[PDB]
Every structure is written in structure tokens, then in C-alpha cells.
Amino acid sequence: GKTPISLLQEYGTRIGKTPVYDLLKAEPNFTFRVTVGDTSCTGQGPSKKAAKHKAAEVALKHLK
Numbered sequence: 001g002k003t004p005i006s007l008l009q010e011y012g013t014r015i016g017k018t019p020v021y022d023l024l025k026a027e028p029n030f031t032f033r034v035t036v037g038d039t040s041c042t043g044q045g046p047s048k049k050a051a052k053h054k055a056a057e058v059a060l061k062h063l064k
Contacts, residue, residue, distance in 0.1 A: 004056040012036050021052050034059050
């Protein structure tokens with residue numbers, strides 16, 4: 001019952017690529033970029049966590 005955020009977190013730390021999030025846009029709509037080592041993608045959402053959730057989901061699908 002773990003979320004993409006915690007999954008990305010756990011995987012990332014195991015392979016030496018702990019995810020880092022950067023708030024890009026806050027206009028409410030938030031745009032966050034997540035970076036996992038060399039890989040990066042963006043996600044948007046109604047709240048900071050919601051946006052980090054989307055970014056993580058995408059990076060998770062791509063990586064694995």
C-alpha cells in the first residue's frame with residue numbers, strides 16, 4: 001500500500017538516485033520537477049504533494 005512518492009524514494013535511495021523535487025510554478029496549480037539522478041520529469045496538481053505525486057508516478061513508470 002505504498003505511494004509512487006515513497007516507492008520512488010525507496011528505489012532511488014537503493015540505486016544511489018534519491019529523488020529531489022523542485023517547485024517550478026505556483027499559480028491553485030503547482031508544477032514540480034522531480035530529479036532521480038540523471039532522469040527528470042514534471043508533474044502538475046492542485047497541491048504541492050499532488051504535483052509531486054504525479055511527477056513521481058511518471059518517473060517511476062519510465063525508470064521501471
